[PDB]
């Protein structure tokens with residue numbers, strides 16, 4: 001129904017409009033790629049966009065929606081950064097053909113009625129301080145997937161637990177979509193890019209390099225075992241000024257009811273002032289490579 | 290390589306991936322996929338759903354047969370007649386039967402699930418608080434596996450039908466939900482596999498549910514209270530019928546409007562057998 005100008009950025013706010021356009025495109029043979037974001041786009045988001053872009057004959061749909069359901073009480077929702085103008089400009093510069101920018105009313109016309117209940121993983125790690133956070137994420141992603149019906153959906157490895165939960169959602173509900181995890185984009189010194197980084201002042205920005213330095217040190221110390229790996233990361237974090245560690249955990253790659261055996265993920269969350277930063281890295285125990 | 294599909298014949302698939310591939314292939318050939326979810330032990334009521342699906346032009350009918358463990362209260366006793374069920378489908382001209390195992394549907398146990406809205410805790414949700422989460426979770430999965438153009442459910446389980454409409458709207462599902470009128474025995478009793486459990490006196494008293502509903506529907510020209518009182522009087526004239534609820538709601542099961550369309554629902558226990566029924570009501 002709505003107009004679609006190829007080669008140009010087409011912005012649709014109505015779920016029905018992007019649904020009709022996606023369907024039409026899909027019918028002509030083009031493969032639909034979906035990159036779900038909450039706006040305030042930076043180089044990390046662009047890596048996802050570029051990963052989607054390189055899929056042969058694909059049309060990229062980037063959704064921008066600050067999902068109220070994944071925010072807990074507080075001014076977290078009001079505090080989330082919003083920079084619409086820069087966002088669309090960057091999408092246009094990346095050659096993205098579709099931006100989906102829905103209203104809260106169009107996504108939640110009936111408030112929170114039917115929702116997604118994540119499995120046990122949602123209550124741990126990031127879910128500890130926010131028991132309802134991932135139910136909000138999976139509910140909106142399921143909706144986005146039903147609206148856009150993409151062949152592949154892209155998520156960053158930076159938010160590893162979120163990526164694992166999306167894989168669980170897709171597997172558990174038999175969703176016909178491929179989940180593509182994209183490697184974390186980092187600043188020159190290793191800091192994982194994140195919109196929350198804008199809240200780090202000069203001193204905090206300097207100290208924040210400790211998360212990634214700790215993780216990479218652990219990844220290399222891992223030839224000596226799990227204890228060596230964790231102790232190396234702890235030492236780096238402990239030597240960092242003003243870094244308060246929330247958690248530092250080594251888990252199996254699925255983060256589930258499975259012990260660590262050889263391959264794993266080391267995850268860290270720490271507070272620098274009021275800014276909570278996260279990072280994670282692949283870990284191989286007893287492997288020199 | 291797409292699994293084999295023989296047109297005009299009943300094709301049975303147990304693997305979710307197989308029916309998924311066949312459904313996708315058929316949709317591309319210009320067929321409209323119709324889904325009729327069941328738990329087997331098929332009777333005339335189920336056949337009405339099948340016939341509703343069959344009459345859609347270009348239809349290819351998929352009937353799923355899966356005893357869903359998640360919708361059973363805190364399973365083995367449930368009746369299972371594979372051969373006879375399949376025979377009825379073949380006689381109806383159904384081309385696809387999807388018969389997955391529990392392990393195939395829940396390869397990871399109960400992990401991610403559907404949390405229904407608050408309507409799921411009312412009416413039937415009173416005695417079985419987790420029943421509808423089970424129903425919506427398995428229906429979402431079946432919809433994703435089969436990707437039908439339309440899905441059919443009987444009006445007999447009206448609350449179930451309404452919650453599935455909520456599921457579809459809330460998750461932006463691209464499928465039409467079709468409610469099919471309740472098939473009834475000669476005296477009005479809603480057909481149900483559990484009716485066989487009623488002894489003679491119970492089966493005779495059971496006519497009270499449908500008689501109470503139809504009486505209420507006609508009494509409705511006199512108002513909502515008149516409709517409710519008429520239904521209660523009919524249920525009150527029957528022995529051994531323990532009414533759990535008799536409620537008049539709007540068609541989406543919210544509060545009944547001053548006037549207009551509504552739905553009257555009843556549930557009662559006769560011995561150890563629980564029966565339910567419901568009917569459209571027009572107030573005034």
Ligand SMILES: Nc1ncnc2c1ncn2[C@@H]1O[C@H](COP(=O)(O)CP(=O)(O)OP(=O)(O)O)[C@@H](O)[C@H]1O
Nearest residue numbers: 037038044155156158159183184185193194195196
């Ligand atoms: N540095 C990075 N490298 C790769 N992917 C990244 C990334 N930063 C974010 N992403 C991915 O981009 C997607 C959208 O992220 P958002 O949820 O919009 C917030 P954010 O960009 O992660 O920052 P914030 O939580 O600090 O505000 C997610 O799938 C996320 O994992």
Ligand SMILES: Nc1ncnc2c1ncn2[C@@H]1O[C@H](COP(=O)(O)CP(=O)(O)OP(=O)(O)O)[C@@H](O)[C@H]1O
Nearest residue numbers: 327328334442443445446471472479480481482483
């Ligand atoms: N008499 C009837 N008329 C129309 N649809 C009916 C019906 N009885 C059942 N159905 C529909 O058939 C589908 C399968 O439901 P089932 O529970 O598996 C059969 P059932 O007869 O309701 O068994 P039950 O007595 O164990 O509850 C549902 O969509 C249900 O509403």
Ligand SMILES: [Mg+2]
Nearest residue numbers: 159194195196
């Ligand atoms: Mg983030």
Ligand SMILES: [Mg+2]
Nearest residue numbers: 445446481482
């Ligand atoms: Mg039933």
